[PDB]
Write a structure and sequence with these properties.
The structure is a homodimer. In chain A, about 35% of the residues lie in helices and about 25% in strands. Chain A is of the alpha/beta class and about 230 residues long. Chain A has a single domain, classed as Alpha/Beta hydrolase fold, catalytic domain (Rossmann fold, 3-Layer(aba) Sandwich). Chain A is built from seven helices and nine strands; from the N terminus they run ββββαβααβαβαβαβα. In chain A, α1 links the parallel β4 and β5. Chain A has a nine-stranded mixed sheet, with helices on both faces.
């Protein structure tokens, strides 16, 4: 576990790269924080299929979070980044399993969060992630009770790690907001509803909007999610 | 159409009763407005089954709206008021049909809105109503294009006027927020989803929370709906 020198001050957003070794895997990461000065909350950002920790909408959300005094951290998921939506690619399943699957994801995010807590201090921590971000985030949230609130979505029980999602959903006990797209071509509305139903928490709310997988309304993806985490994460 | 003298100043909320004669029916109503002083927007409030225009949660929503500078108006629906949830009663269907059904509802609300616009000035106008409030509100919104935004919910296609709802849903073209309860004992989640799907507007969003028909979370029913109408109704 170490900061890897790949840094940049942002405008008011400081970006710092890091890298971890976990169970024989190399885990690259990125940390976003206010340049000036202190930040009392953290959100882990899970990237969407065939993208990576520094893909655009993830950086957009991170910038908005930092604006609310909330730092953000992301790592690359199995077979992505350093190491349309990529959960739709035929080659995606093999990328996921070769990377160590859901257990690897759980370990990698636990090590990343341990790293950040030692370097920056343990803080109230949330999860944000859609599509592959939920393939990762639902297990992480189930496994690591440092996650106090989660924004999840665009995933159901027919996903590549669907069995692990169904198994681990009952163990998500923190508040959740879940997003689905009515006309999602990758994740059927019924499969998304099934997974939402299985979440253990009583403090869960589903928002469904019209359109394709990539067409979450911007006011929902940005203002809506940021406001949800800003209010709920304390 | 006339104010019927049944008035009360509230604290900062002025309540004034009125009464209309429409196609051989007597239509009792209530109007809530800021005591001091001007109010530039209006919301029509539709009551929930086996209640009435002045039932409690309707008055709660009206008080909150007036707080945002938005007046509110309600009339009694067919076979209710002067003229648990009553859509669950076995006697409800007969109450609805004897009252003139959906066509009567449409006429009555059109006359009430005409009355208010003449007395107070035409303003940007929204709809709020759940359960019987959607049995009424979905037709009204489809029929009267003065309705610029609607909060609807807790209703599906198996309701007593389900056929009229399915027929008229495609003609709802304004923005909508729709609420369902996952474990609604009166309205199955699938029947609610079907009706949401049929709404014509692309600017629609469904929020689903856990629990029974009566258990919409208060932060959803109150802050959430009021904020939605306050932002959207312009």
């Amino acid at each position: 576990m170490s900061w890897n020198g790949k840094d940049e001050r942002k405008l008011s957003v400081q970006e710092r790269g890091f890298s971890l070794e976990v169970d024989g895997r190399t885990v690259p990461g990125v940390y976003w924080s206010p340049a000036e000065g202190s930040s009392d909350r953290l959100v882990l950002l899970g990237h969407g299929g065939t993208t990576h920790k520094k893909v655009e909408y993830i950086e957009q959300v991170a910038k908005l979070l930092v604006g609310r005094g909330i730092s953000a951290m992301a790592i690359d998921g199995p077979g992505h980044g350093e190491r349309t939506d990529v959960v739709g690619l035929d080659a995606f399943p093999r990328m996921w399993h070769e990377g160590g699957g859901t257990a690897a994801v759980i370990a990698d995010w636990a090590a990343a969060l341990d790293f950040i807590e030692a370097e920056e201090g343990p803080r109230p921590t949330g999860w944000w992630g859609l599509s592959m971000g939920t393939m990762m985030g639902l297990p992480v949230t189930a496994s690591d009770k440092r996650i106090k609130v989660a924004l999840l979505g665009l995933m159901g029980v027919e996903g590549v790690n669907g069995e692990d999602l169904v198994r681990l959903a009952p163990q998500v006990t923190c508040p959740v907001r879940y997003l689905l797209q009515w006309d999602d071509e990758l994740v059927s509305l019924q499969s998304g509803l099934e997974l939402f139903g299985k979440l253990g928490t009583k403090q869960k709310t589903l928002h469904v909007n019209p359109g394709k997988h990539s067409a979450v309304p911007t006011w929902e993806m940005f203002a809506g999610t940021v406001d949800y985490l800003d209010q709920r994460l304390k």
